[PDB]
């Protein structure tokens, strides 16, 4: 449950999303889900070409499954607090 | 009867090991667990084949079908 | 209501599934259980009619139900 | 769900994750559904195994042949 | 075990191969057994064009490899 | 159980990784778990066959998902 | 998580990059939705009243805005190698 609480510190921010497809979504970070499933509200498109046929539509869910990257900005995150975390795995 | 008991029957015998993707193994059957991750000797890959020598683990995931001979 | 409730208080109705393949299950529902695995009585295959049928959950894309399901 | 008792002894057709054809006679079963077949033909064209155990696993569909 | 020794080189530069000809260096962040990854100063590359960000988060089911360069 | 054996057995030995996509790592395996991870290391990727054309060499230790393996064999 | 679009028309694309429209009428963790008035857009078809769908299948749910309804690997290898 690391990279679910990582997510849940992410909520009202501004992410970019690519899917498998290479569909690319940039979006607020609206909510996330165990499985890792994310909705994003305000979405916009960064590449003509990687929006997919969606109407005049702002909010989305994404199924975590279907994720290549999440896309961050440095500033959204403690690098030194996510170390620690991940130092404190446990299989 | 029990297919796992077939199995565990071809012990030390040749066996087939079908993939769910196109590609199977002959060789003899060494042991198995509850995963059906079998232990071959002398393992002849097939897609386009190549010849294995010793022990090798083949993963249980992707095992379809035992075939007792090949 | 949950997709799964819905479907096991849907036993003896007919119903359309497609499975992964393309392919088109068409019969009565007779049995669910959790992992949406399914048996049906009066079936007949499309890409053939059969007593019965088993499908593996996993493996069904989507189900027509009856019109009539509420 | 599936009283696989009533097809022992019956040719079935096996659907197999992985777009595997399997046409045998069921000699044999357990609850995880592996199952044994006999003069099992599988298709992919067409070639005719022997005695055969399935894996239940990646068991996708089955019925009567 | 294997686990732990990637817990290993955290905060060094790693690579990882991705599943569709795709192939990122990063300096590890954070990383979990279902291995889904975070980066910073990532660099992506397709086949070749190159795509750069400071920060990451990579999806454990289409990571193939992770070594260092 | 005999496949658990087959690996304490075979941890420092050389060891033929195949994956899924046909790629195969030959390496010492360093550690392997429940899941069929793997760490290897001085591996050196091939395709197919381990006298295949080189498609990379590792100075450090690699890591192959347990979900992805197809087979662990020795050499 | 899907609360919010329970009982509005809602816009999903699927793994196979097919597009529907329907009616989100109930959901599982595992993300399969229960819809109502199914209308494929590639084939354009209504294909069902009601339908179950499995949550493996679909990649994204779009709310449709209900004021304005604009909605209507193995040469790989070969890649490492000249590298």
């Known amino acids: 449950m690391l990279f679910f609480s990582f997510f849940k510190t992410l909520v009202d921010q501004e992410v970019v999303v690519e899917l498998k497809n290479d569909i690319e979504i940039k979006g607020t970070l609206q909510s996330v889900d165990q499985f890792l499933n994310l909705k994003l509200d305000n979405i916009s498109s960064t590449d003509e070409k990687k929006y997919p046929h969606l109407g005049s539509v702002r909010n989305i869910f994404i199924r975590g499954s279907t994720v290549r990257y999440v896309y961050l900005n440095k500033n959204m995150v403690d690098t030194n607090l996510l170390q620690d975390a991940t130092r404190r795995e446990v299989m | 009867i029990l297919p796992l008991e077939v199995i565990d029957k071809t012990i030390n015998q040749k066996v087939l090991i079908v993939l769910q993707s196109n590609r199977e193994f002959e060789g003899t059957l060494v042991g198995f667990d509850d995963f059906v991750n079998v232990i071959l000797e002398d393992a002849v890959e097939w897609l386009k084949v190549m010849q294995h020598h010793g022990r090798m683990l083949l993963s249980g995931n992707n095992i379809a079908i035992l075939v007792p001979g090949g | 209501m949950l997709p799964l409730y819905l479907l096991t208080n849907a036993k003896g109705q007919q119903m359309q599934i497609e499975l992964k393949n393309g392919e088109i299950i068409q019969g009565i529902l007779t049995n669910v259980d959790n992992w949406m695995n399914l048996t049906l009585s009066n079936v007949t295959e499309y890409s053939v009619k059969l007593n019965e049928i088993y499908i593996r959950g996993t493996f069904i894309k989507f189900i027509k139900l009856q019109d009539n399901i509420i | 769900i599936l009283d696989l008792a009533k097809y022992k002894d019956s040719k079935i057709r096996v659907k197999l994750m992985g777009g595997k054809l399997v046409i045998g006679v069921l000699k044999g079963y357990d609850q995880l559904m592996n199952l044994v077949l006999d003069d099992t033909v599988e298709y992919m064209n067409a070639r005719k195994l022997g005695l055969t155990v399935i894996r239940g696993t990646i068991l996708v569909s089955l019925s009567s042949a | 075990t294997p686990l732990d020794l990637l817990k290993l080189n955290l905060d060094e530069r790693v690579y990882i191969k991705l599943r569709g000809a795709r192939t990122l260096v990063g300096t590890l962040q954070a990383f979990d057994s279902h291995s889904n990854i975070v980066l910073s100063d990532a660099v992506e590359t397709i086949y070749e064009s190159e795509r750069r960000s400071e920060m990451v988060f990579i999806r454990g089911d289409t990571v193939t490899l992770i070594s260092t360069p | 159980s005999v496949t658990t054996e087959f690996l304490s057995d075979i941890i420092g030995k050389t060891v033929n990784v195949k994956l899924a996509s046909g790629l195969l790592y030959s390496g010492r395996l360093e550690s392997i778990d429940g899941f069929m991870n793997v760490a290897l290391s001085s591996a050196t990727e091939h395709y197919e066959s381990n006298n295949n054309k080189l498609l990379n060499k590792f100075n450090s230790d690699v890591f192959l998902r347990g979900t992805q393996v197809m087979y662990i064999s020795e050499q | ?83």
Do not use: C, M, P
């Open chain 7, 1 to 83: 998580t899907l609360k919010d679009y329970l009982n509005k028309r809602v816009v999903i694309i699927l793994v196979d990059g097919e597009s529907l429209i329907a009616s989100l009428n109930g959901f599982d963790k595992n993300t399969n939705l229960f819809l109502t008035n199914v209308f494929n857009r590639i084939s354009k078809e209504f294909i069902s009243k009601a339908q179950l769908l499995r949550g493996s299948e679909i990649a994204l749910v779009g709310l449709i805005d209900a004021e304005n309804d604009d909605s209507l690997i193995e040469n790989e290898h070969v890649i490492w190698e000249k590298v």
